[PDB]
TrEMBL record, chains A, B, C, D:
Mg(2+) 3 binds at residues 223, 260. InterPro entries: RGP_fam (IPR037595), STL-like (IPR005049). Mg(2+) 4 binds at residues 238, 260. This is Transglycosylse. Its main location: Golgi. It comes from the Bacteria. It comes from Marinactinospora thermotolerans. GDP 3 binds at residues 10, 37, 39, 107, 254, 287.
Amino acid sequence: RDISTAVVVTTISDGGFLDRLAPALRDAGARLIVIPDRNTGPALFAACERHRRLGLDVVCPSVAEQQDLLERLAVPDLIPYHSDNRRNVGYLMAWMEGFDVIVSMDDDNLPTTDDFVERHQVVCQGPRTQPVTASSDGWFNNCALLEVEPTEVFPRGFPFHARPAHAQARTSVCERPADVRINAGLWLGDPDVDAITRLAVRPNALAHSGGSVVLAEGTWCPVNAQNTAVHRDALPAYYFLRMGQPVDGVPMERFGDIFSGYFVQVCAQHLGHAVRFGDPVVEHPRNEHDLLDDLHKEVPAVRLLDDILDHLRDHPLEGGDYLETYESLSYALQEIAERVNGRAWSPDARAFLHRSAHLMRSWTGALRTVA
Amino acid sequence: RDISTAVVVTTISDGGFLDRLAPALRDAGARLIVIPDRNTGPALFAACERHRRLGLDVVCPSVAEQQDLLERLAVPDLIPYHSDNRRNVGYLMAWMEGFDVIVSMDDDNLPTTDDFVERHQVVCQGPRTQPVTASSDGWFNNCALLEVEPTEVFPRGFPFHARPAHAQARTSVCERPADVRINAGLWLGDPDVDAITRLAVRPNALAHSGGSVVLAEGTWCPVNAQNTAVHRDALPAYYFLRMGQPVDGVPMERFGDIFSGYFVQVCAQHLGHAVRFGDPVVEHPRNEHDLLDDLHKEVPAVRLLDDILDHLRDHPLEGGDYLETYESLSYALQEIAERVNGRAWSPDARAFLHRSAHLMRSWTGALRTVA
Amino acid sequence: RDISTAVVVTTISDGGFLDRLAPALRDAGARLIVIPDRNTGPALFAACERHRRLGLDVVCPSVAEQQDLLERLAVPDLIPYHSDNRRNVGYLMAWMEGFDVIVSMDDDNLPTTDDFVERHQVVCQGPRTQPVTASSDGWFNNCALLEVEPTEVFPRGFPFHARPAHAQARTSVCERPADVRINAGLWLGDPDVDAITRLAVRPNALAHSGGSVVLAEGTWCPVNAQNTAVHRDALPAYYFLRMGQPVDGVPMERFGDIFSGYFVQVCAQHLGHAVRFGDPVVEHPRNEHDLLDDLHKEVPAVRLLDDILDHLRDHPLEGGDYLETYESLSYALQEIAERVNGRAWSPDARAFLHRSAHLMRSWTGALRTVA
Amino acid sequence: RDISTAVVVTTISDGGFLDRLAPALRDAGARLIVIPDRNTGPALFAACERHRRLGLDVVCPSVAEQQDLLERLAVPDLIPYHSDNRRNVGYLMAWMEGFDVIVSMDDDNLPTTDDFVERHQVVCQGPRTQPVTASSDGWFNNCALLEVEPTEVFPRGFPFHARPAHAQARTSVCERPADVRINAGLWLGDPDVDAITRLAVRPNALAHSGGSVVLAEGTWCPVNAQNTAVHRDALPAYYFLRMGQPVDGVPMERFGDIFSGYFVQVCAQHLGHAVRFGDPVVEHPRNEHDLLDDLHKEVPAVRLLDDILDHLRDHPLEGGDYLETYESLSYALQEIAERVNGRAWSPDARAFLHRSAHLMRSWTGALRTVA
Ligand SMILES: C[C@@H]1O[C@H](OP(=O)(O)OP(=O)(O)OC[C@H]2O[C@@H](n3cnc4c(=O)[nH]c(N)nc43)[C@H](O)[C@@H]2O)[C@@H](O)[C@H](O)[C@@H]1O
Ligand SMILES: C[C@@H]1O[C@H](OP(=O)(O)OP(=O)(O)OC[C@H]2O[C@@H](n3cnc4c(=O)[nH]c(N)nc43)[C@H](O)[C@@H]2O)[C@@H](O)[C@H](O)[C@@H]1O
Ligand SMILES: C[C@@H]1O[C@H](OP(=O)(O)OP(=O)(O)OC[C@H]2O[C@@H](n3cnc4c(=O)[nH]c(N)nc43)[C@H](O)[C@@H]2O)[C@@H](O)[C@H](O)[C@@H]1O
Ligand SMILES: C[C@@H]1O[C@H](OP(=O)(O)OP(=O)(O)OC[C@H]2O[C@@H](n3cnc4c(=O)[nH]c(N)nc43)[C@H](O)[C@@H]2O)[C@@H](O)[C@H](O)[C@@H]1O
Ligand SMILES: [Mn+2]
Ligand SMILES: [Mn+2]
Ligand SMILES: [Mn+2]
Ligand SMILES: [Mn+2]
């Protein structure tokens, strides 16, 4: 059977990134779902049509076409505008059309090898006994698989409480049954670190030297949405969380895929599935960012992430598939919002988990409508 | 059958208010459930024991006894301390002990007649054809039943959008079947107005001249918790909402009973029940308050109340009893939080309804545990 | 003896208000300085030219002409756009051109009599023995000069702490030397009350029945900028204060003329000058406003006004003219910002008085440049 | 020639740090001024008396003695409690008593050599031709004088915009006249980096390998208050800035010595004086800190520091001594607060520079009172 792959990219650029992204996608026959926004210029639509007649199966639904679909599914207020949260439209469209693989990318992640789509098809491998990687502290640093200067770094969304003692953790590999459903490809150039790390050492990923790994049950690593393949069964749990909720009056941002990466990861391991890190590797000539503005956006989420990850360890989930498990996860987040203690847990911070949980069940309700 | 009545009062005073509250409660054999807090002095416990040996069936469970009960019901974080929200403990205790009538009062509401408890027993009257009062605009002003100087006023929690045109509304009385389950007694001296009205005209309620009324379906009026009797069947919907959630960064307060008054009211009319206003009347020598501080607390809730009340009109509910209806109301509030539009509906304002809905279902879950 | 009058109005309307404002100004030969903004449509410029051809000495400098003037005076950042603070440009222009009387008005205040300009010329009367009105509590309610329904009201900016006991205050009139330099004309229709009063009673001013008064030293009343004449000597202290400073994170608005009215009033009394209230009376068909939004804007300033007014009584001022006295007042506000105590005096609230003081001295610095 | 040295430390510890701090201070006959706070336990007072009997000239004035002193100098509200800002009391006391050298330290900075006081006496050296260090980019990284693992770091308060291109900057040493008035000793163990750096790489200072340098005019480096000697002439410009002012609603902290270090540095260079970095080196077993809480406190100041430093380059100062120059700097900060542009410059951020400027002049006013 032929594996179908759909690449999802939301962007506000002029479409010039298609010149380097299309070749690997066009040669493999994969579909590219470009999600524009209201603040997206008309040059993107002209760039999609130019690459469409070059052989690329690219679609670029206008904001009017996106809103009509979301209104038919009784979720007109779920996905906001002027935000990269609109990539959920691409997730939904690729899921309705029955694609096997959904590859989430940004407009500044460019494949480096011809087998980019083939490597991401590993999420359709199925269960089989394979070498699995476990860590004594329950955390794995995927940036250790890369050659990074000037010093060692951690990925964005990695819990800070476990960073100092992670160097003494024991990494072991064992032959165990595993079912890879999420494949987080690595990145060269500017690695996916938080604004804290980028402001401190300005890391530069030189090469991919560690190969690929599959994480065992209990070993976690943050998964982003800039070079990540998700099997269609696991896609219901890959909802990009809506940002903007204030923490002590400071609205959070840039962590929509940090939560989605951990949410689909804890849902996968509950269902006997695993997350893979490594190939395919992409180039990340990162778009220009105000690093102090990125820091101001991420800190509200960083202040809560360690506590959320700690409570998720002690909260067992229920469900037979990803829809039931993700909805069970949403109820667990509401229980965590009331038991967690900390100086950063103001009433607006606790209410952030409650509104997020409602939006998660609103996302699953839309998927159950098309199904 | 003898009707059982339990009066619930949470306070941080020294207990001197018992000298005028006990006579009407003691002569009727009603129980008084005083709910202290961590910021409550020991003089209250000595005042309860002094009145207990005078004939009053008064109980004053310590914060250790309250927390033990709430922990046994799997709700240790539901009711916060240093807040008048602890009156929910009195609601829960009176409901577990099987009291027919639950009368919510404050420590500055003093009965004026000997039949205070007997008048509040009207919530056990049952269904019968009685004169019911309807208004063309769907709103009733209970302060019009009082002689107020220097001008006409509206009760606290009355929607502001309907105040200017309420004078032209048509009030009609018709003989219809009604089942009174909530009785909001009126107040003399300082009436229950919002800080806007109290700062503007400083109203003084002189006498109760309008008698008593029972409101028909579609006619609403805010119900407070300072002189209100609730039948035990309707008590599950009388949960005092938790305050402190910020609206555009400003934490709301003083509207815990505004929401509970409207919530139990919309739940009652869905179940074919009605709300009564009038006797018994109490004196309100209001405690000393910083009126500008009261205003700063109420404004965050005032900015949202009109929109919430508008959407509740167009949202039909489900349920066979008050537990099912209140839980259905909690889900309706979450749908309203995403459809409502307005300048005051910041992400923290929308998340206020989501966390409140979770706390409402957490309150119903505790009632289902003892049941 | 040849008195010149310039009227200052800043607006974002289409200029239709000129149809009822021009006749009284055109017959008296007074100049109208209309200050447009960036959010002002082009119809206002066409309305000014249409009325200019009818005989009205009206000027309407574009935002480019305003910014060039403010840049030549080394104050390019003093006056913001998208704000009614731009009336300070009109204050500055009328002062540079040597006008004797500067009448501050809004686009919804319309004269009711033909002698509108002549009555406002009372600020050029000079010192003389005249009936002077004093109050035992130090406050005068100018709304008592009007017939107001449905109840008695207080003007916007009146201290709330002195309202309840003001009815017991003794009002006496004596023949004393006085020099009227500020004349606050009254308003029919919608009186100038705060949002607290307008939301509570919705006042309607029927007629001007109390005549005119001149307040003694030690008797204060807030002076707005919608129908107020200021002598050119007192104009340097009439700087419309810049709004937007947060108080506990809540930005203040609608009180720029409340401070300017009190500031020019305490400066005038220090120099032996007085404030007049009464004629000329204008009609105020108030523009449409979101009253709950007006409340949310005014509360931050209302929380601090009573304390600021109390300290201005204890603080003696220095200076020989309005420029020196206004600067001395600016330093006094900085001393008050550190000695005042209260729950509403967060660090941002105290810093509001410091930035306001610098902007006051920046306004006087620009006036010293043209002089 | 008979040089007096007073060490200033404010602390809430139990006084155990005196065991390792007294020997170097006691052998040199220097005075130790310990400034307790309201949240300081009584064990500190017992530790000071225990070390006083051992020969250490240590004083520990109670909060009542501090407040009496600050009240006599007409500055009772300048220095808040429950804050390390109370070291300004120690700065004031050491200045009133005529000490030549004022060494600012914290309770976790411990001398490593016997000549600790003698090395800090370099601020009494006077003008002479000496090796002076200049940098092409105008910045010097004093952490480059240390052996730091695992990677190169920048000191706390170093501008982030100049960090990437600083490696390409040219460092030259020339024989020029210089007058050292501030000597910033270095620190082993935990270096003085911001929370961004400490969270990212967790630096560890191994040894002092770069020697000592004296910076030229136009070469800046942040100066902290944990191991810094200031000549008594330069002490008036060393006022520890008061924290707590919100930036976009987020109160700043931990940067009181970042401003004081830059302020005393720009004042010294205007007067022909210089700043020295190097010996004496102290050990810094840093007190336990919540690093994410340190980050949440520092970000508000980090968002504004690069812009403030850029404008201080363009702003010329006036004055003959440090008092006149510091006051001239205070007025310069007010001009900068209105001309600076950026996303982080909300009204509360601009007003922070205005209230800080008034507090700077309030500090100089108290110094002019004792003089
Ligand atoms: C931002 C976070 O870090 C990393 O990206 P990081 O290089 O920082 O961020 P960028 O790669 O610059 O931006 C991520 C994507 O968001 C798109 N985008 C930006 N603004 C908008 C907008 O207003 N609307 C829409 N529809 N799209 C928008 C942008 O074109 C790009 O495809 C990644 O791991 C993830 O993007 C993650 O969420
Ligand atoms: C406040 C609102 O307006 C009206 O009251 P309004 O006279 O303003 O307010 P009060 O009658 O002064 O206070 C209401 C009740 O709250 C209690 N209370 C106050 N502070 C605390 C505290 O920290 N803990 C606890 N456990 N109790 C507290 C107080 O003793 C009294 O019984 C009424 O309609 C309702 O109380 C409504 O919620
Ligand atoms: C507003 C306060 O209450 C009372 O007025 P109140 O009827 O509420 O307010 P209005 O009369 O509706 O508005 C006051 C004036 O502000 C102008 N204005 C409104 N928005 C803008 C804007 O963005 N830019 C500029 N340049 N002008 C603006 C408006 O056209 C009118 O001339 C009075 O006492 C005083 O105006 C006082 O300041
Ligand atoms: C804190 C900043 O970073 C670096 O220190 P950093 O190790 O972080 O901070 P610490 O050395 O832990 O604390 C600095 C000093 O503040 C004192 N302190 C802490 N809390 C209080 C309090 O509530 N009141 C008073 N009076 N003192 C207090 C503490 O005992 C110690 O002497 C240095 O460069 C500077 O201290 C700088 O200001
Ligand atoms: Mn990117
Ligand atoms: Mn009360
Ligand atoms: Mn108006
Ligand atoms: Mn330290």
